[PDB]
Amino acid sequence: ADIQTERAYQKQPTIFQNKKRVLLGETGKEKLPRYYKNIGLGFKTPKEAIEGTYIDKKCPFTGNVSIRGRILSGVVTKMKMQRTIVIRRDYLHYIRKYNRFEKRHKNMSVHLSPCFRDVQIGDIVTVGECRPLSKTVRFNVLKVTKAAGTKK
Amino acid sequence: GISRDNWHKRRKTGGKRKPYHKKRKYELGRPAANTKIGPRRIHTVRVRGGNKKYRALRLDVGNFSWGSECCTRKTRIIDVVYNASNNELVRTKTLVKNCIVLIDSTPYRQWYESHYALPLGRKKGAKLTPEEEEILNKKRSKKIQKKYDERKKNAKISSLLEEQFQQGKLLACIASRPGQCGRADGYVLEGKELEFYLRKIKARKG
Amino acid sequence: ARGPKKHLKRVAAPKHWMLDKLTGVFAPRPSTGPHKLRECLPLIIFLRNRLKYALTGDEVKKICMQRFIKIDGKVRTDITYPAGFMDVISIDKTGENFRLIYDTKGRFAVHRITPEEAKYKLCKVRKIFVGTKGIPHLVTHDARTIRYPDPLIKVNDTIQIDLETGKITDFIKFDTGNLCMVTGGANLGRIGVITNRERHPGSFDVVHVKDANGNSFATRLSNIFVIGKGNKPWISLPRGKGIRLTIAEERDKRLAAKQSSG
RNA sequence: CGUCGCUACUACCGAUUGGAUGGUUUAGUGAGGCCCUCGGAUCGGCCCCGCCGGGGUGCCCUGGCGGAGCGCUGAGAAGACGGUCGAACUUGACUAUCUAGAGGAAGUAAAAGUCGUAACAAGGUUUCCGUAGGUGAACCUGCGGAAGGAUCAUUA
RNA sequence: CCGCCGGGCAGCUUCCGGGAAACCAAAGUCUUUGGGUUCCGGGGGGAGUAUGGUUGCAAAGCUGAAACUUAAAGGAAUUGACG
RNA sequence: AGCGUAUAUUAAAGUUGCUGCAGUUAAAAAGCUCGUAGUUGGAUCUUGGGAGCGGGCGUCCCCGCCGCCUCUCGGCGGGGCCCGAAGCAUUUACUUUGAAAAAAUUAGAGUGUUCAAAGCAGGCCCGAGCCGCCUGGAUACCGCAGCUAGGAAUAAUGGAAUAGG
RNA sequence: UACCUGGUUGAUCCUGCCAGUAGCAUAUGCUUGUCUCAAAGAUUAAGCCAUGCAUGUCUAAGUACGCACGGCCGGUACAGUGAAACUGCGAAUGGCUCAUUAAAUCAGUUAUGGUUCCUUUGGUCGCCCACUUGGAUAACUGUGGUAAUUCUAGAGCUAAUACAUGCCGACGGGCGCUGACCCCCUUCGCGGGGGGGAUGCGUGCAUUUAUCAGUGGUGACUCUAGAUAACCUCGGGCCGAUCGCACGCCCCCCGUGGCGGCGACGACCCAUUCGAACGUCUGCCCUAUCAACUUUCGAUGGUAGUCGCCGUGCCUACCAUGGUGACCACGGGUGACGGGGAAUCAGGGUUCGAUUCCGGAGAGGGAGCCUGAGAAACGGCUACCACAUCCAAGGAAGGCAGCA
RNA sequence: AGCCUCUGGCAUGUUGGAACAAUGUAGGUAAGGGAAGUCGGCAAGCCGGAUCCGUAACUUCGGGAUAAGGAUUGGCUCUAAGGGCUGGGUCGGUCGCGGCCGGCGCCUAGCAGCCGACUUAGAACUGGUGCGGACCAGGGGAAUCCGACUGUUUAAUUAAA
Ligand SMILES: [Mg+2]
Ligand SMILES: [Mg+2]
Ligand SMILES: [Mg+2]
Ligand SMILES: [Mg+2]
Ligand SMILES: [Mg+2]
Ligand SMILES: [Mg+2]
Ligand SMILES: [Mg+2]
Ligand SMILES: [Mg+2]
Ligand SMILES: [Mg+2]
Ligand SMILES: [Mg+2]
Ligand SMILES: [Mg+2]
Ligand SMILES: [Mg+2]
Ligand SMILES: [Mg+2]
Ligand SMILES: [Mg+2]
Ligand SMILES: [Mg+2]
Ligand SMILES: [Mg+2]
Ligand SMILES: [Mg+2]
Ligand SMILES: [Mg+2]
Ligand SMILES: [Mg+2]
Ligand SMILES: [Mg+2]
Ligand SMILES: [Mg+2]
Ligand SMILES: [Mg+2]
Ligand SMILES: [Mg+2]
Ligand SMILES: [Mg+2]
Ligand SMILES: [Mg+2]
Ligand SMILES: [Mg+2]
Ligand SMILES: [Mg+2]
Question: Which of A64, B131, B175, C156 is at a distance of 20 to 30 A from A86, taking alpha carbons?
């Protein structure tokens, strides 16, 4: 179920999985030893990364990507793609003439690892600059905080 | 020629980028290898850096391995099975990274039959009786008998492999780039791997 | 561009081979070397521009191809071979041998040293390597690698390299309390003991530095190259000793030396 | 103030599937290069013999002169099948820009022609808006408005 | 009838203070310049025209240019002078 | 020794008005109303006070203090001591200090170019016997965004209520 | 220097404009004694171009046997100047111009842990021809064509650091697994323990694949390093084991064997330097008489691929059905190469910045190409298109946006 | 629809034989040109099916409209894509492979086997560019006049306005 769905076999490389000629059922209890990493900057590699049965190469909590540069935040506006969302960064660009500001935004597509469950729209989300991961997407979601506004 | 550039295609929004420069030696694309199975044929290519690149166009053999047993005899690649990308590359027998391929079992057989000294497939007593016991029947004993009785239970194989060795062909998957590298290197499909790809093959043919 | 650029316009030329707007179009361009183009002194500038030893470029050509000039005791015939922080430049038929320490304003001195003190030399370290078969490598700021270093040498520390041998001889880890000349930016060729550094992950790290008189500049780490255990620089310093006098003070102190001096 | 009269200049409308350049490109065709598959002018080398000479143990190692299998790898040009970028050419589409035009209708000039006299004084008919309808021209008349009036009132 | 109170329609009066002026409890708080915000004008005509778009069954509605020409057109109040 | 006209453009233009125009009549406020974006949005939350040093027995100006938490984390057989980590500055906006900011240009240190535009040298020591000394090539700005560190005045923004620290 | 004056009206106060004013920016009108600085075919036509030139190179150290000249002197190959020719570099910088280009150039900022790098620096280099083996062309010599070119026909020679080839080395010596086996202790013997092993196969710095363990290094390894199994990108990995000029030596020792300095090219691992490249964040002119755009002709994403230098809808296949928008997209325009600055200027702006400094682009226009580290290179070529020269009519040579 | 065939029906539509003249009536085809043809393009041919692409002026906002204008189409070998039907209550007990009870299971993401029509898309290969190959089968455009459209009409010369 669930994991091997696509066509080619999806597997964490740097775990070779088989060797077994001993008792204690078949395979281990974890069964597959799961490659995960700590990322850095203190963000807790979340539970569902380590627990998770799942597999996405582009997740930093379970695969090959390096986070390495510019850390930002935005808000989640659309989750209609698969393993990617759109965030929307708001601001004041300043004119000097007119000694005031105007609101702006540059929405930004961004990888969203499915470890990182129960996200919604109107959701504060922090992102790391990553490898240029798809055509638009250079950023990867690191800590969703769902915070400002509404409810647990 | 056949470039590789962000320079031409639309922007995120859908506006059309104008050009900028000409194509530069840079965003350079060569045509494909789409390497086959025949007697070896590889052309070099001169690339960026200086440096070179071993584009295989005919390729017969691979340096490609057990996972578990921890060996890798060099072996003939007999035939392509399915390739997840696309279903011309199967038919045309085009080896590319993550092709599933049949290969010769023979060089893997012939070091159990050294090491743990227990057969594969099943036979009456034609090859087995003259040659296995020619590998067995000791006149050293003591140290060795202890040794490949310490090579214990776990001279063992999964049924799924055990099967294939009857046939003298193993399922394996390419992990090098024949077009980039120059070789058709890989692992043996072993255990979990080995079970879609059969079930893919089975479901595919019907 | 197509290839790499083998040329340098005067003006674009950094602020310190100290060149003037007239006299030419081009500046000399460091031939590639150990030191980065922007933090150099192409030999040529010593000779005609700093010492007034030669006059022109051809005068310098005729110097270095007698083979008098020895940049760290190894003879250079390239008029544009780049020197930079912590070099030697022995003349030998003269017995002068200078360094290349920068002044308090950051503009490479004409600071003469002994015949001794042309052996010891300093070098900051850029990385530990672990090369192959566990043979460990340094990378000095002057692009020496030195195999087989003492395992307690870490990154950003300095080495008291010999010269005729290469090699290393004793060394200074980068703690608090030791002595720093600054090799980048603004507080440049300014000298003082550390105090405290501010580790940041990602963006490179800040280093607070106190000096003799008690003036705290800070810097990015990658500009600080150290020079002693603490209030004891192993090298001779330039007159001024990277203290840096406010234009106000400098003005008056220069002018106050004047009149009383006779 | 307007029609009307004459003269001059702008842009307008305008029958003419009006003309010209540019940019996209739908469709076709498609130079040359680049890749792939062949090819094989040829050129060797390896070799196999005939005969001969020098050195070695009939045989071998070298040498000389001839011949032939052109055996089997290498190099290898001209060429040809395919594929890919693709100028170019041909026909459509769009949009941009720019202009040719019989004849028609404004404005302006502008500024002194004729016929009136619309407006400003209660402008002789308070004036004006919108709408409508009319009329040689200002115009006129309905209806509803407006006072920017010609009444801040009409005398319980 | 006589008061008060809220919010309505209004009146007079005044050297607040405004206001080119006529006037204005507000058009007051403005070189002592900014409480919030919407619309919208930049000499007069050409012109609310041409063209384009759109709505309308259509009158028409809405959006809405330029070349050209033009020196004032205009507003408030003053004396005139003619009704 | 220049001086004229040709026109683009700036002040002049309080005639494009952010600062900073105007809308009874002068050109001008939709016929009226609803209303999504945008802009804009009352008040309300640590203080008075303490302890000292310093100006003018006490009173009145002037300064370092009473960021909290942690010590779950380092260590400068049981330790402390507190820095190393993080709760993190609710989450910013704001402000101040760093660092980084190519030169030329600019602002502007230094300088008998004979002055000046300039130039960056020059100055000196010297009767040259010195067979040579001495100093420069200053500095400030460098928007916004980005990076760092103080402050918490105001503006948002957050947290416990079908229970939770 | 915070700024005004003329003009509507019998006269007034306004709105408002016209007209003055100064600088700056470009025309040319006239005049011109000295001297110092000093811009210059950008706007129109990145239109066209006569001609003249703008990119060659030798130390002692890659070949040199031109008879060129000497030498100084030979016979021994050299000797020493040395015209040519092969070879290695460069020619990838500079110079010019701004046609295009509106988040595109570009600034600042960051990334490369999603990469390549000639050169310089530092390093590192021992597995029967090495007392170097083979072979082949240019100059050179001769015989040739064509009308003509920076056109070659063809016969002899002859070099190499050009092109191939491939050896001593190292230790029948050492260490991985295999091991003909063997010995001793223990055991009734099986078995348990201690040993020791001829002979095989391996006998690596790089390569690719596979696996295993966890000296040093980061906020950030799926890194470096280490262990095992393999292969050979194989001629087209490397070194592995490369060639000149100075010629100077010592030998428990006589002529061999050891040694000395310089260079040149290698190179592999590597560092480094000039970079180059592709990414992050944030930054632009006008326009709605442009409101929806984008999507089987990749639009956004996932998966798997091919290609490249690398991550990447760079491309293919199969899936999903996305992404942007009045915080004004999308569409159109520019008398738009982008910055750094300029003249203006009470404070705030306004326009200009083709302008020497930085960044980009293009050599009539496009495309493709060789070659190269490095170029899609125009002082290369290949066509086409677009231009244009000589002609013996068969053919040939054309690119000033190098300087004149 | 056309065209070829079984069942069923005929025997060429009131005669035959021999040639292949002119005129005819039915069919065909033409180099180069291409309406010059006549009163006039009178007849015929161009077009023609499907799939894909694509689409004007004008409007009664339905249409126009198969507008216009393009591409493809064979045979062969493949691939891909479209559905039905049945099956777990297994473990224990007990009763006769069957039932009943009770318990666990509970594919509730289904998976397994067994059936059977058809289509559609894409890819090779392949043939002297042939492929809607027999037949079926809209020539198009720009205008004016009339009549709103459907229909009807002078049976034996007018179908129109
Ligand atoms: Mg302002
Ligand atoms: Mg009026
Ligand atoms: Mg008002
Ligand atoms: Mg105001
Ligand atoms: Mg006007
Ligand atoms: Mg102005
Ligand atoms: Mg002003
Ligand atoms: Mg005004
Ligand atoms: Mg109103
Ligand atoms: Mg004045
Ligand atoms: Mg008058
Ligand atoms: Mg004026
Ligand atoms: Mg250049
Ligand atoms: Mg680098
Ligand atoms: Mg134009
Ligand atoms: Mg030209
Ligand atoms: Mg170019
Ligand atoms: Mg070109
Ligand atoms: Mg040229
Ligand atoms: Mg008949
Ligand atoms: Mg009949
Ligand atoms: Mg005909
Ligand atoms: Mg006719
Ligand atoms: Mg007909
Ligand atoms: Mg029609
Ligand atoms: Mg009809
Ligand atoms: Mg009839």
Answer: A64
d(CA B136, CA B99): 38
**C37 CA vs E59 C1’ separation (Å):** 82
For chain A, how many residues are written?
152
**DSSP string computed for C72-104:** TSS----TT-EE-SS---B--SS---B-----T
Strand G atom within 7 Å of B204 CB:
no
Query: Which residues of chain C have a Cβ shorter than 8 Å from any chain A Cβ?
Result: 201-202
Characterize the bridge pairing of strands C191-198 and C179-182: antiparallel
Instruction: Assess whether C136 and C110 both reside in one domain.
Output: no
The C-alpha of C202 sits at a distance from chain A's nearest C-alpha, in angstroms, of 7
Q: Give the dihedral of Cα atoms B55, A7, A138, A115; nearest 10 deg.
A: -140
Residues C142 and C158: their CA atoms lie apart, in Å, by 12
Q: How far is the CA of A122 from the centre of ligand 22 (A)?
A: 80
Within window 13-42 on A, which residues have Cβ closer than 7 Å to strand G?
A: 13-14, 16, 19, 35, 37-41
The reply to whether A97 Cβ lies less than 7 angstroms from strand G is yes
On whether both C154 and C135 belong to a single domain, the answer is yes
Q: What span, in angstroms and rounded, lies between the C-alpha atoms of C185 and B33? A: 52
B47 and B53 Cβ atoms separated by less than 8 Å: yes
Resolution (Å) of this entry: 3.8
State the angle between helix axes of B159-167 and B192-205 in degrees (0 to 180), rounded to the nearest 10: 60
Kind and range of the H or E element at C249? helix C247-260
Q: Is the CB of B204 under 7 A from strand H?
A: yes
Question: Which structural technique was applied?
Answer: cryo-EM
Quote the minimal CA–CA distance from A43 to chain B in Å.
Answer: 30
How far is residue A145 from each of residues A43, A120, A150, B185, C241, measured CA to CA in Å? 12, 11, 11, 45, 53
Domain ranges, ordered by start, for chain B: 1-30, 31-105+169-206, 106-168
Alpha-carbon gap, residue C151 to B105, rounded angstroms: 50
- Domain housing C144: 121-171
